[PDB]
Design a protein around this nucleic acid. Structure first.
Ligand SMILES: [Mg+2]
Ligand SMILES: [Mg+2]
Ligand SMILES: [Mg+2]
Ligand SMILES: [Mg+2]
Ligand SMILES: [Mg+2]
Ligand SMILES: [Mg+2]
Ligand SMILES: [Mg+2]
Ligand SMILES: [Mg+2]
Ligand SMILES: [Mg+2]
Ligand SMILES: [Mg+2]
Ligand SMILES: [Mg+2]
Ligand SMILES: [Mg+2]
Ligand SMILES: [Mg+2]
Ligand SMILES: [Mg+2]
Ligand SMILES: [Mg+2]
Ligand SMILES: [Mg+2]
Ligand SMILES: [Mg+2]
Ligand SMILES: [Mg+2]
Ligand SMILES: [Mg+2]
Ligand SMILES: [Mg+2]
Ligand SMILES: [Mg+2]
Ligand SMILES: [Mg+2]
Ligand SMILES: [Mg+2]
Ligand SMILES: [Mg+2]
Ligand SMILES: [Mg+2]
Ligand SMILES: [Mg+2]
Ligand SMILES: [Mg+2]
Ligand SMILES: [Mg+2]
Ligand SMILES: [Mg+2]
Ligand SMILES: [Mg+2]
Ligand SMILES: [Mg+2]
Ligand SMILES: [Mg+2]
Ligand SMILES: [Mg+2]
Ligand SMILES: [Mg+2]
Ligand SMILES: [Mg+2]
Ligand SMILES: [Mg+2]
Ligand SMILES: [Mg+2]
Ligand SMILES: [Mg+2]
Ligand SMILES: [Mg+2]
Ligand SMILES: [Mg+2]
Ligand SMILES: [Mg+2]
Ligand SMILES: [Mg+2]
Ligand SMILES: [Mg+2]
Ligand SMILES: [Mg+2]
Ligand SMILES: [Mg+2]
Ligand SMILES: [Zn+2]
Lengths: 23, 97, 206, 83, 127, 61, 60
RNA sequence: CAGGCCUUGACAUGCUAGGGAACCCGGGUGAAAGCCUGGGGUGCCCCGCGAGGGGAGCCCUAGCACAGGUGCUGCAUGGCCGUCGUCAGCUCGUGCCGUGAGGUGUUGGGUUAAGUCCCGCAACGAGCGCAACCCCCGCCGUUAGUUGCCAGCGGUUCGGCCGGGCACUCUAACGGGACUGCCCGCGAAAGCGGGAGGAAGGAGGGGACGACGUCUGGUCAGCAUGGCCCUUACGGCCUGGGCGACACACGUGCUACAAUGCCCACUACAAAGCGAUGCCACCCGGCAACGGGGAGCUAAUCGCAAAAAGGUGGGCCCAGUUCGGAUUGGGGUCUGCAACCCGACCCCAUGAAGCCGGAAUCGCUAGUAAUCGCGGAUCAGCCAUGCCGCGGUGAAUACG
């Protein structure tokens, strides 16, 4: 879910990037 | 020979687009007529009252219109007669090669 | 309290700005603060001259303050000495080549900002507030205005229970955009508090 | 935490206070307001008075509390529960 | 050799070019069915030449930008409806009653202050 | 990596360490309140547990 | 505590992280816009007067 | 709030006296503020081969006049705002009625979103309102053609990239367009039902706009302002704390409880905005936050930028789970003088409640609700899941 930061969905929510949502 | 015109009022911005193009059309020849670029709107949204009445606002904006002007063949009979031009107060001219 | 400022409402349709110039984001505020510092000085000094509107134009390190006024001879003074007593004190806070101009107002009783200052001074001089309004609305109508409306809010006659009083003649369409309604507010300070004076002058539709 | 590209933070004025004591055969009671100054090995064995906003609480510093800040040991709010 | 129309709907503009052909349709370089793949509302974009049995009498070279996939579908549906009647005016009747030649102007009503959306209001609580 | 029991013992050892020295985090783990800056006036229920409803102040009739 | 806070705000601080905008007109600290030097209230008073170049009551 | 400090004071105009300075670089102590200090070197018009003596921006020490107060009173007030209510209303001038308050007009018949309009009438007009004039959206035209666009011939490293063109799309200014103007029907009329043309039809959709007044409504803490009040303190500077507390209770929201879902990979389609100790292409280091390089852009050109849901392919198989992401341990990153109280982000691990919610209760009538993401203001950073905007996909229902 959007609250799960360790996912490509939660990173979109916080507007941030990481291993779980790279660019 | 390129001129770009900025100004808050578009009526002064637009009137000064003919009063420039038609000058370089008096000292010919080739001119590229007044093209308008997209406007840049700076929006301000303010609580209407001085205190606590949060769900009532009033909108404001500052419109910075933009026009482009190109003179193809210089011919210094304008490089003198454009320096001798009478453009209104609220407008910025900026001239590029 | 609900009604919108008749000038801000008509800005672009019937009222031009009192300051006209362009300035990219990097120095709008600086020219704006300067604009305010000027108006502060002139509204103080040129109060007894009958100040009605300060126009401030600006282009390239120079500024053209244009003062519309009831008694221009007061502003200029002796042959242009009191005029230049300001033309330089202005430029002492302007730094720029601060050109000053003086304009004659065709009718003072047709200038809403002055009517309000007149009535505001009449209460400071303890005149009858009810009478002092009906008198002013009378002069504006005799001067050809298509309608006028004047309003006093506060401790009229020093009454503990503050109050609002007004009078209006002709017509004052505040909802019409093509109506030219001059508007002017003045503040009247007395010993028992402060009083608000609002003036609406319907000049005509265009 | 503080980016270790930068140093470990001690307000310097507090750090002088402790290195003089070591040199002169410590220890005096050290009263500081730098609740932020990181506990640093040159402090163990001393006792620092930490201002929690009202008082200077004594704090005896031991080896097992080094990576911490001084404010951690002078709490700022007194509680005691609700009636 | 060419009969064009302009089709507009919801922040989406569409240039459609009707030309003689077998039936092949293209939209921005890709094939029609490759650009609206699986978007089951695709077929509706070609209903104008189903109201006049030219369903294979043309090839359409179409350009779209702005809006979304569906906003570009009715953008087409109006444009090809326009390019068609621009190929012959008699097509107007039987195309006007199908609502084809008309641009529906349903746009996103703006957000308004004191609200969560255009009209969705903050939840009322009387205490 | 260290797992099941040892990981719990090393997690327990660090909480225990924070409680022993008396640092602010140590008082949080004692009284059972949150540790990472969260406010407690309202929720904190995961850390506080079921609500303990008390009586409140009264109005006037 | 107000006028001495109009003053302390103008001054250059001990650390650049200690600087805050104040309304140049009324001295208010909150809701001051960078573009104008004005708070959200003076922004509305000068706007309606027409003493704000090129700003116009928006509507769309 | 605590403690350490200042006393014509952080700030204003004025008067003196002593210095006689202006300003810039330090130093001792101290948490800092502060207190104590140390350097050099002021023109102004002057008498000048002299001592220089004066005077003057501005400085500084003592002395005053005075400053200062977010102290109190919104039940003394201006200004601004909320509200009833974008509800259809509130009144005036003359005449008429009534001893008078007051009535008439403004009521009545019909019609409208409307005191909108029509007919009637001891009334006849008028004003503030309603409408309209104004802004955005919807169709067409003119004018323009770069930084925007590429219809058709030429190239083309296959990028509108080059020639070239402005047709189109767009961009932005001025115009056209709809008025019950037309037909059928009703009606005394205003109007109402339907039709045709038409992008749009009955006020096209949305905005801005809020009558006389109400609520002794709200704000002396935005500002202004009367009065009352404090004056080595109710003023001022600092450092630290507090505004973030937590047996509890309520409001507004975010995230969910799963399969119309979740997950990974591949792949499409927006709009409005912002961007010179700014936005950052691309490059290497790093699992990542980021870091180092490093072009372009004073921006229809360069950048934020990936839009997301979606489309395709594959994995999970009904589990407190590959649902959910709280809580907690450890390790970092970054802004900042400084992240203990009290920042945001990233990575390993931890993986709570929650199985659709009692009594009760909210919003929405259409590109609306619902859902998806995107931007801006404030801003060093950020507790934004808030607000103001933006488009994407797109219903259900109204008997009454
Ligand atoms: Mg998951
Ligand atoms: Mg709200
Ligand atoms: Mg008195
Ligand atoms: Mg558009
Ligand atoms: Mg939407
Ligand atoms: Mg807390
Ligand atoms: Mg003040
Ligand atoms: Mg700050
Ligand atoms: Mg601020
Ligand atoms: Mg009280
Ligand atoms: Mg009041
Ligand atoms: Mg009031
Ligand atoms: Mg109160
Ligand atoms: Mg009524
Ligand atoms: Mg009468
Ligand atoms: Mg009777
Ligand atoms: Mg009578
Ligand atoms: Mg009467
Ligand atoms: Mg009435
Ligand atoms: Mg009546
Ligand atoms: Mg009535
Ligand atoms: Mg009656
Ligand atoms: Mg209405
Ligand atoms: Mg009548
Ligand atoms: Mg053209
Ligand atoms: Mg209106
Ligand atoms: Mg009250
Ligand atoms: Mg007061
Ligand atoms: Mg005040
Ligand atoms: Mg509850
Ligand atoms: Mg929330
Ligand atoms: Mg809730
Ligand atoms: Mg971004
Ligand atoms: Mg579980
Ligand atoms: Mg359970
Ligand atoms: Mg799980
Ligand atoms: Mg941790
Ligand atoms: Mg912190
Ligand atoms: Mg289940
Ligand atoms: Mg439910
Ligand atoms: Mg409705
Ligand atoms: Mg969802
Ligand atoms: Mg920010
Ligand atoms: Mg937090
Ligand atoms: Mg956001
Ligand atoms: Zn202000």
């Amino acid at each position: 879910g959007k609250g799960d930061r360790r996912t490509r969905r939660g990173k979109i929510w916080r507007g941030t990037y990481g291993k779980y949502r790279p660019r | 020979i390129r001129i770009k015109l900025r100004g808050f009022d578009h009526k002064t911005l637009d009137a000064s687009a003919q009063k420039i193009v038609e000058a370089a059309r008096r000292s010919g020849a080739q001119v590229s007529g007044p093209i308008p670029l997209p406007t840049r709107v700076r929006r301000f949204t303010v609580i209407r009252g001085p205190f606590k009445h949060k769900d009532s606002r009033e909108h404001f904006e500052l419109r910075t219109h933009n026009r482009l002007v190109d003179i193809i063949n210089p011919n210094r009979k304008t490089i003198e007669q454009l320096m001798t031009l009478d453009l209104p107060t609220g407008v910025e001219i900026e001239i590029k090669t | 309290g609900n009604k919108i400022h008749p000038i801000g409402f008509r800005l672009g349709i019937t009222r031009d700005w009192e300051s006209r110039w362009y300035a990219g984001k990097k120095q709008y505020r600086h020219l704006l603060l300067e604009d305010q510092r000027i108006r502060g000085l002139l509204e103080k000094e040129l109060y007894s001259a009958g100040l009605a509107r300060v126009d401030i134009e600006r282009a390239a390190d120079n500024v053209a303050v244009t003062v519309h006024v009831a008694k221009p001879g007061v502003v200029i003074g002796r042959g242009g000495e009191r005029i230049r007593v300001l033309r330089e004190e202005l430029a002492k806070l302007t730094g720029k080549n601060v050109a000053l101009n003086v304009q004659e107002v065709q009718n003072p009783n047709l200038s809403a900002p002055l009517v309000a200052q007149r009535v505001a001074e009449q209460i400071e001089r303890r005149f009858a507030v009810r009478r002092a309004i009906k008198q002013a609305v009378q002069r504006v109508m005799e001067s050809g205005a298509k309608g006028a409306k004047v309003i006093v809010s506060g401790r009229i006659g020093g009454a503990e229970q503050a109050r609002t009083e007004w009078a209006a003649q002709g017509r004052v369409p505040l909802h019409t955009l093509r109506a030219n309604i001059d508007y002017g507010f003045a503040l009247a300070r007395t010993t028992y508090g402060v009083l608000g004076v609002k003036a609406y002058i319907f000049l005509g539709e265009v | 935490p503080r980016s270790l590209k930068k140093g470990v933070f001690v307000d310097d004025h507090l750090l002088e206070k402790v290195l003089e004591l070591n040199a002169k055969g410590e220890k005096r009671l050290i009263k500081t307001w730098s609740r932020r100054s990181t506990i640093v090995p040159e402090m163990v064995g001393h006792t620092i008075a930490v201002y929690n906003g009202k008082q200077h609480v004594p704090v005896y510093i031991t080896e097992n509390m080094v990576g911490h800040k001084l404010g951690e040991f002078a709490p700022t709010r007194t509680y005691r529960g609700h009636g | 050799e060419q009969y064009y129309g302009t089709g507009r709907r919801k922040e989406a503009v569409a240039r459609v070019f009707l030309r003689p052909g077998n039936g092949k349709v293209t939209v921005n370089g890709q094939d029609f069915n490759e650009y609206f793949q699986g978007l089951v509302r695709a077929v509706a974009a070609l209903e104008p030449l189903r109201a006049v049995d030219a369903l294979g009498h043309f090839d359409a070279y179409i350009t779209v930008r702005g809006g979304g996939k569906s906003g570009q579908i009715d953008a087409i549906k109006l444009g090809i409806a326009r390019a068609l009647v621009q190929y012959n005016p008699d097509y107007r009747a039987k195309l006007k009653p199908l609502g084809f030649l008309t641009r529906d102007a349903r746009v996103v009503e703006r957000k308004k202050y004191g609200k969560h959306k255009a009209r969705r209001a903050p939840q009322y609580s009387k205490r | 990596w260290k797992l099941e029991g040892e990981l719990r013992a090393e997690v327990a050892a660090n909480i225990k360490r924070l409680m022993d020295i008396g640092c602010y985090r140590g008082l949080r783990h004692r009284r059972g309140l949150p540790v990472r800056g969260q406010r407690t006036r309202t929720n904190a229920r995961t850390r506080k547990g079921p609500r303990k409803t008390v009586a409140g102040k009264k109005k006037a009739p | 505590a107000r006028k001495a806070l109009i003053e302390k705000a103008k001054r250059t601080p001990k650390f650049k992280v200690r600087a805050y905008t104040r309304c140049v007109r009324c001295g208010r600290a909150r809701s001051v816009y960078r573009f104008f030097g004005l708070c959200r209230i003076c922004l509305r008073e000068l706007a309606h007067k027409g003493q704000l170049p090129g700003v116009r009551k928006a509507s769309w």
